[PDB]
Structures are given as C-alpha cells and as structure tokens.
Structure 1
Amino acid sequence: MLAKRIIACLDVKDGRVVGDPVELGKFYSEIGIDELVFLDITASVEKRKTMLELVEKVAEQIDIPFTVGGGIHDFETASELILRGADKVSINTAAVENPSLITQIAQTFGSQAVVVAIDAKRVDGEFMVFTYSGKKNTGILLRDWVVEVEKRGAGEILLTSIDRDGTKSGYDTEMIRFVRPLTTLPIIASGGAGKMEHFLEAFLAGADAALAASVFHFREIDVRELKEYLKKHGVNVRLEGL
C-alpha cells in the first residue's frame, strides 16, 4: 500500500548546506528519508546559476526524488532547474501572483514536477494565504487557493502553518483537516514537528507526507526509529530492513 512519506528539508547557500548538500542528501537516502527538499537562500545576483549547480550536483548522485526551491520566480527558472535534473520545483509567491505558472510547469514537465508551497495563517477566524516569506497577507482564503492550485495543474501542496513554524508545538492538524477534504492533491505538512507523536497526528489528520528540518539534521527524532514508531500506530510507512 502507499507509504506515508518522511521528508527532509535542507537550506542551501553557495552550494553549501546552511555540509556538502550532495553528501548529506546521499546519507539521508541511506538512512531512509523518503524525499529531499532544498530551500535556497543564495543572494539575488548569484541565485540563478548557483541553484543550477546544486541541482546539477545533487542529480548526479541522489537516488530518491528531490524538490528544489527558494526564489523560483518564473517559468524560465523552473524550466532550467527541471531540465538540469530536479524532480520538481516549489513555487509560492510566483504561484500566487501568476497561477498560470503552475499550468505552464504541469503541462511541460507533468504535474509531478510542481510542488506549490502554501503558507496560511489564522486571521479573524479564517485561514488566509500569505506571500513574501510569510510577510504579506494576500487577502486570499486558503480554501480558495487550495482549489485553484488543484485546478491549475499542480501535483502537490506543501502546506505550512506560519505560526507553528519553530515552536515544536506539533503540526497544524486543524489546518490539515480544513485542507483535507478540499482537494485530491497529496498534502505535505511543514512547521511544528517536535516529537514522533506529532508525525502520527499529522498523518491521522490526512497529510500524505511530513517534512522536518533541524530535528532530522540535529537528531531529536531518528528516521529509522520514527518510522517503526509510526508503524506501531497503524501508519503504513516505507521500512528498509536488515
């Protein structure tokens, strides 16, 4: 049966994890991470070709899917990074400001290739969509954005609950449930994970995958131990063996 995905997120800069990103991702593949996601913070002048060598390097040695993002602002950018070897790109601001960008990506490289990143926040009792690294209220309802995202062709939603991010308070399972019946797109929860229990919850709320950053890198949760755990609580995950 289909496995609940455990996704790891690395921040890159000048081709370096803010180790060697190819190195660490290869190691994450050997310990049983299901997918990698690189969020890129290189300056503005350098981003273009740096993001290209990153993809170029990762794609030479990684044996699992990987997503690239950070400041992917147009189709040209999206196009060079996919033709370079990235399995998909993530778009957020440029997705909201220009939703045909999603269809241009989906139609050219397949829906598989577009991960749309949504950052919602509860405002006046509503789930509202924010852009510019969580800094602008677009005044667009999550519910409205989630349906449009599917309808435009995207393959997946990376759903981040702004306020939960960094808290260790757990995933925004209320947000997940609100989003859950609204779309058939696989859902990735991001921001809040602190302990193995939290993964279960997000999965029970109907998330298709769970993403984390530090806790994986800095080792509060074990990938191996996280899955067997999850496995013990009725969640169907991928589990190597030896």
Structure 2
Amino acid sequence: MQRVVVAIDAKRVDGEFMVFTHSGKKNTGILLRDWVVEVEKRGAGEILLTSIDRDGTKSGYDTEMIRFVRPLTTLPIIASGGAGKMEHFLEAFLAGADKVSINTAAVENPSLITQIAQTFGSQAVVVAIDAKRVDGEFMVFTHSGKKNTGILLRDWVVEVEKRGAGEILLTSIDRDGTKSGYDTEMIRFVRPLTTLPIIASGGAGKMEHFLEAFLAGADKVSINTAAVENPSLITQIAQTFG
C-alpha cells in the first residue's frame, strides 16, 4: 500500500541495468527489471530511483533508466536528482518520473522547490533532508552529509512545506555524514512542524525498528540494502502498516 518506499540504486554494467547495494558499491547480480517488478508485487508504495556513477556515488538523472523502469511499474517513480536546473527536472518527468527528489540543490537554491511545484504539481517534489544534532540543535547537512549549512532543521522543514514540497525524506546522519539508523527524537521533532508525509530513511532492517519510526511520527520508511537482502521486509511492513 502506502507505507513503504523502496530506494533502488542502479547502473548499467555488462550491458544490463543492475541493482547496487551498500552505498552503490556492491553489484548484487539482480536485474533492475526483475527487482522493480518484485518490489511492486511485495506492496511498495513508491520507488526512489537513483542512477549511480562508476564508483557508486549519486549521479544525475539517467533518462534511459527512467524510461526503462516506467512500463514495469504502476507506482510513483521518484527520480533522485543530483541535478540543479528546470530543464534537468523536465527531462526526468518526460522520461517517466512522477516526482523528483532534491537535497543539496534545494538547500542552495530554495526557489527550485517553488519552480518545480509551480510547473509540475504539489505532489511532484520530494525534499530529502539530512540532519543531525550539533551544538545542541538539529542542523541541515549537505554535500553527502559533510557540510553543516548553518540552517536549523526546524526552519528548513517549514520552508520546504511552504515552497510546495509533497513529501520529506528524512535521514539521520552519523558523525562523519553517513546514513545512520532512525532517529526517533528527530522524527518526533519534525512531526509537529509539517502536515506532509514524512519518509524516514532507515539505515537498518528489523520490523520493530520500523515500528518505532512509525510511532515516532514517520508515515513511510525508505529501505534499500535491507530490502534487497531480505525482500520479505517489504511484504512485512506493507502487511502491518499499509
């Protein structure tokens, strides 16, 4: 149903789009075509699709990859930006994406939220926010969790709502900027600031881990490596929560 977002990182290797796990380092051997179909059947709510470059890092929209995934699924496809311009975004939507996910691009140019929302719709923008507590405040980090922007999480969540974001993808990050597990206190902190769906980005894969995020206030969880390694997690979450 609605509670599961599957994030899929993929790139063409050996002439096929293949699914990568562990921060885009491990070629799992799984065809993107098979995995997209299987996640839909297991009850995923939407797919966050990220094209990754030669060493695993987040690359820009791959329109061929978006067009390839499109006929396999009736779910919303969220294309994970990496890109900063109005024509960048148009290309993803023409290729088949239903939404784009932006993070550093949005932070550095907030009007991109507004521009995309104005052109493509109120459901078209996902803002991904990486954040951790520093100096006694939850602060927004950009550039793969490395730069403390100086922006309070509380201010940015409000601003992205006002600019017309459709959902927030929230990731708690650890001491060196990598994706950490659910921060329930950060989820509870963001809950009262926004009437949008909050997607908590997981970092870990056991079913009471997920319950805690939903009890903290998250409406959906995003899973990637945990789902690939144990695909029934998708089915379990969908069964319990929607």
Return the TM-score normalized by structure 1: 0.85
Deviation of 1:4 after TM superposition, in Å, equals 5.0
Asked whether the 8 Å contact 1:160–1:189 carries over to 2, the reply is yes
Runs of 4+ in 1 over 4 A off after TM superposition: 164-167
Residue 222 (str. 1) matches residue 233 (str. 2) = yes
Cα 1:4–1:201 shift into 2, 3 Å: farther
Superposed CA deviations along residues 200-224 of structure 1, whole A, max 9, x for unmatched, are 1111111111111111101175322
Please tell me the root mean square deviation across aligned C-alpha atoms, in Å.
2.1
Superposed CA deviations along residues 45-74 of structure 1, whole A, max 9, x for unmatched, are xx55x6100111111221211211141222
Deviation of 1:192 after TM superposition, in Å, equals 3.1
2:83 partner amino acid: I
% of aligned pairs identical? 59
Relative to its length, the structure with more helix (as a share) is 1
Q: Paired residue for 1:155? A: 166
Deviation of 1:16 after TM superposition, in Å, equals 3.1
Which of 186, 190, 207 is equivalent to 1:175? 186
Asked whether the 8 Å contact 1:118–1:157 carries over to 2, the reply is yes
Deviation of 1:43 after TM superposition, in Å, equals 5.6
Asked whether the 8 Å contact 2:66–2:92 carries over to 1, the reply is yes
Which of 51, 57, 67 is equivalent to 2:68? 57
Deviation of 1:23 after TM superposition, in Å, equals 2.3
CA distance in 2, matches of 1:40, 1:73: 15
Deviation of 1:124 after TM superposition, in Å, equals 1.1
Q: Paired residue for 1:32? A: 43
Asked whether the 8 Å contact 2:7–2:224 carries over to 1, the reply is yes
CA distance in 1, matches of 2:72, 2:231: 27
Which of 7, 15, 19 is equivalent to 1:17? 19
Structure 2 residue ranges without an equivalent (≥5): 21-29
Asked whether the 8 Å contact 2:18–2:32 carries over to 1, the reply is yes
Which of 221, 225, 228 is equivalent to 1:210? 221
Residue 126 (str. 1) matches residue 128 (str. 2) = no
Aligned residue pair count? 224
Asked whether the 8 Å contact 1:157–1:188 carries over to 2, the reply is yes
2:65 partner amino acid: L
Q: Paired residue for 2:25? A: none
Return the TM-score normalized by structure 2: 0.85
Q: Please state whether the residue corresponding to 1:86 is helix, strand or coil.
A: coil
CA distance in 2, matches of 1:111, 1:90: 13
Relative to its length, the structure with more strand (as a share) is 2
